[PDB]
Amino acid sequence: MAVNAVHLESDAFLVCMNHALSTEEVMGLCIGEVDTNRIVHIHSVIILRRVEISPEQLSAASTEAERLAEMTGRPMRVVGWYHSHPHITVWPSHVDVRTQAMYQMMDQGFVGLIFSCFIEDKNTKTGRVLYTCFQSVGSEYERIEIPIHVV
Amino acid sequence: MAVNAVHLESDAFLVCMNHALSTEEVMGLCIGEVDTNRIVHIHSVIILRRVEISPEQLSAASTEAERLAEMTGRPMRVVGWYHSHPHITVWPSHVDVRTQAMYQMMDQGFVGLIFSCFIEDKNTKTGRVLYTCFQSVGSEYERIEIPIHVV
Ligand SMILES: [Zn+2]
Ligand SMILES: [Zn+2]
């Protein structure tokens, strides 16, 4: 079992929350660290528009990794990826599962993260936001949920 | 200081050594882990032919990351990149420094690794192989050597 849990610091949570409400095609970059107990600490999340990473994406990631490392004193890095599900259920689409899968070909403890304000019940007057953390598992891959906590 | 030292297990060393002798354009992928003391453990190295990673490169990396994690029990990942300097000095070319620099925009503790059997003295009868570990540091980037040990 690669990752036991994911500790998401409250500020990075609020960022994902704010974009989950956007309700509009982008993807986020989770930045933080991993400790002895296979726990992924996410201190910040940056949201921007085979495996390829644009120089625009690199500079944004590096800038926050600098700001975080300068704050904490510890070295930071990209540990996960975020995107929103405003028009579908919070669960990872089969594309997300196959995407996360090839991400794990590099970090193996890499993490998939999804927020969703979507509600199919069109008669309820009650607000809802879901957030799940997932990975991937011959033959096809499938979702495996990772416990996620907020600090 | 992102990384204190690099612990390179003896078998991964021999691999880099074997290709350093090839004397012939490829690049290697260092696979391992990082611990509390900012030490990069490299358990294996795979050598194959903006930031882009081919699906051919991904499958190779994942396969060894599986084999290592199955052996050690701990989760593995890509921690560095290797290439040989058979026709130049062991020191990182300015391209290597700029390459390593944008690698660090993702991992920050990511490591550059170079082996070299090159000897400019054409009158000496004595064999030599150098290996250095480096990173990158507004304005231009420059080489910063990382201590490297073999297990
Ligand atoms: Zn999706
Ligand atoms: Zn070079």
Numbering used by the authors:
A (entry chain A), B (entry chain A): 1 to 24, 27 to 51, 59 to 146, 151 to 164
From the paper:
To understand how KIAA0157 supports the catalytic function of BRCC36, we set out to solve an inactive-state structure of BRCC36 in isolation. Unlike CfBRCC36, which showed a propensity to aggregate at high protein concentrations, DrBRCC36 existed as a concentration dependent monomer-dimer in equilibrium and readily crystallized. Interestingly, DrBRCC36 adopted the analogous homodimer configuration involving the MPN domain (buried SA = 1693 Å2) displayed by the CfBRCC36-KIAA0157ΔC heterodimer (B for stereo view and combined sequence alignment), with the main exception that the CCHB helices α4 and α5 were completely disordered. While the MPN+ domains of DrBRCC36 and CfBRCC36 were highly similar (RMSD of 2.0 Å over 140 Cα atoms), notable differences in the active site region of DrBRCC36 were apparent that might account for its lack of DUB activity in comparison to CfBRCC36 complexed to KIAA0157. In particular, the E-loop of the DrBRCC36 inactive structure was partially disordered and shifted with respect to the CfBRCC36 active structure, giving rise to a 4-5 Å displacement of the catalytic glutamate (Glu30 in CfBRCC36; Glu27 in DrBRCC36). Additionally, a major portion of Ins-1 was disordered and the ordered portion (helix α2) was shifted relative to the corresponding position in CfBRCC36. Both of these structural distortions may be attributable to the loss of supporting interactions afforded by heterodimerization of CfBRCC36 with CfKIAA0157, as follows: Firstly, in the active heterodimer structure, a productive conformation of CfBRCC36 Ins-1 appears supported by direct contacts to CfBRCC36 helix α4, including between the invariant Arg53 (Ins-1) and Asp186 (α4) side chains and between the backbone carbonyl of Arg53 (Ins-1) and the invariant Glu183 (α4) side chain. The absence of the CCHB elements (specifically helix α4) in the inactive structure precluded formation of these interactions.
BRCC36 is the catalytic subunit responsible for the majority of K63-Ub specific DUB activity in the cytoplasm and in the nucleus as part of two distinct macromolecular assemblies characterized by the presence of either of the MPN− pseudo DUB proteins KIAA0157 or Abraxas. The Abraxas complex (ARISC) functions in DNA repair and breast cancer suppression, while the BRCC36 isopeptidase complex (BRISC) promotes interferon dependent responses by deubiquitinating and stabilizing the type I interferon receptor, IFNAR1. BRCC36 consists of a functional metalloprotease JAMM/MPN+ domain followed by a predicted coiled coil region implicated in protein-protein interactions. KIAA0157 and Abraxas are required for the catalytic function of BRCC36 in both complexes, and enable association of two additional shared subunits (BRCC45 and MERIT40) to each holoenzyme.
